[PDB]
Design a protein around this ligand. Structure first.
Ligand SMILES: Nc1ncnc2c1ncn2[C@@H]1O[C@H](CO)[C@@H](O)[C@H]1O
Ligand SMILES: Nc1ncnc2c1ncn2[C@@H]1O[C@H](CO)[C@@H](O)[C@H]1O
Ligand SMILES: [Mg+2]
Ligand SMILES: [Mg+2]
Lengths: 254, 254
């Protein structure tokens, strides 16, 4: 009779709201500093850079911008996750497609996303969305973004979707398009693929966690790359016992 | 054969490590500014202040300090949560007591906690732990803190535990003791009771979430009060369907 713990946490708890507000406060402070003192590097990795040796698209004289993942980064998909909890069928690509098409009035903003987006625009920073919602559902997604109070997104200018190129769920191509036009000074997401495709398509659960602590990646967290919680679905909900609970740290009760 | 999703997320995922590193980066930047420009208010609520109208213990000329919850804020209780996942018996106060006594070699630091604590001490900020581990298990808890790389804690100076007063799991009394001696300029936690007992002992799930968005509270997140994720146990894992999925945001698949 109770929803899954991850959904209780993410959608129900004050803990999760405080955590999200924290991310957006750190992001606004970071953008503010960069608006006063424009950086040499943008926050989007250069083509061909690896997690071994991160290099970035330079900032240049391009217009300042912030890039956001949509789902569980600025918008909470309450309707869909209600359905998943009611039915137990969270993995259902056809129902997800229906949801992309008809869910625009069952979303809520992530706590602080509305204030955060308004502030970015008042600082002269363009807000750009890069989501793996499908291109053919661009218009319902625009209306869902507007309904969540996040403003007016425009396909191919400030909204980039899966299928806008032939890389599928890989977002690096769209990041490159975006970084070719703007100086992206902050990027927000709830999954590591919202920052680099290099975290996915191969690396194990333990490899990906280690990669976030690589020094040139680790410096980005809360300082260019901003993270929102998602213990409900996606690339964080993987791994067996040996990858979640490493064996030097195990213990048995008496 | 797979652990609970919240544990996959928190202990296994790079998503969760990046999120924690973000919290500690924002905290170090905030402490740094406060070390240059000492504030008038500390970060600990004054006695008698309400969530309606937050007021704070002044900073004065007291020594600078940062206060941390221990469990799932600076230290990951991997051994205990392995046991909980293996057995299904997460709520077991006797096994938790055993764990307090014998788990010191089955803990890991939260990503970034070791670097963060070292930096605070190099900046001249005293690191103070306020945990609801029990007073009578102070010494194993000191050794677990040291094992996690978090340095040397001292009962009644830099380590405060449940039972140090007669308020039980209520931490406001110990916060007051701490704020009477230090200018606490940052406080970290994974549950709202790590910031104020006023979030607990009454308020419903939806009330507590709303309270984090009260303006004078909302300004603290990532800016004095720093949050770490815990979708595994505690006050974030509460509420029925109506409190997790509000009814204006519900949706049915076709
Ligand atoms: N609870 C969930 N479980 C699985 N996939 C989910 C869930 N919520 C949303 N999704 C999304 O639904 C699609 C597959 O069901 C993917 O895009 C995935 O990200
Ligand atoms: N998975 C868990 N479920 C319930 N309580 C837990 C869990 N992990 C740790 N605890 C702690 O164990 C004690 C009760 O089992 C409480 O202090 C609670 O915070
Ligand atoms: Mg997302
Ligand atoms: Mg804790």
């Amino acid at each position: 009779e109770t929803p899954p713990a991850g959904m209780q946490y993410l959608y129900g708890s004050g803990e999760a709201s405080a955590l999200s507000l924290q991310a957006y406060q750190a992001l606004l402070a970071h953008v503010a500093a960069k608006v006063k003192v424009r950086p040499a590097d943008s926050v989007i990795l250069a083509e061909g850079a690896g997690l071994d040796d991160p290099r970035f698209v330079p900032c240049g004289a391009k217009p300042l911008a912030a890039v956001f993942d949509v789902d569980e980064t600025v918008m909470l998909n309450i309707g869909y996750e209600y359905h998943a909890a009611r039915t137990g069928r969270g993995f259902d690509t056809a129902a997800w497609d229906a949801w992309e098409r008809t869910g625009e009035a069952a979303v809520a903003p992530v706590p602080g996303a509305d204030r955060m987006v308004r502030a970015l625009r008042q600082m002269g920073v363009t807000v750009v969305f890069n989501t793996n919602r499908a291109a053919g559902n661009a218009e319902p997604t625009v209306r869902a973004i507007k309904a969540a109070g996040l403003g007016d997104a425009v396909h191919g200018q400030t909204l980039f979707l899966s299928g806008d190129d032939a890389m599928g769920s890989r977002k690096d191509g769209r990041r490159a398009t975006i970084a070719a036009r703007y100086c992206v000074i902050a990027m927000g997401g709830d999954q590591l693929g919202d920052f680099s495709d290099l975290f996915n398509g191969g690396p194990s659960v333990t490899a990906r966690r280690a990669a976030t602590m690589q020094p040139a990646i680790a410096q980005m967290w809360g300082n260019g790359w901003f993270v929102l919680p998602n213990p409900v679905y996606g690339s964080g909900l993987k791994g067996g016992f040996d990858e979640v609970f490493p064996l030097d740290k195990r213990w048995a009760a008496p």
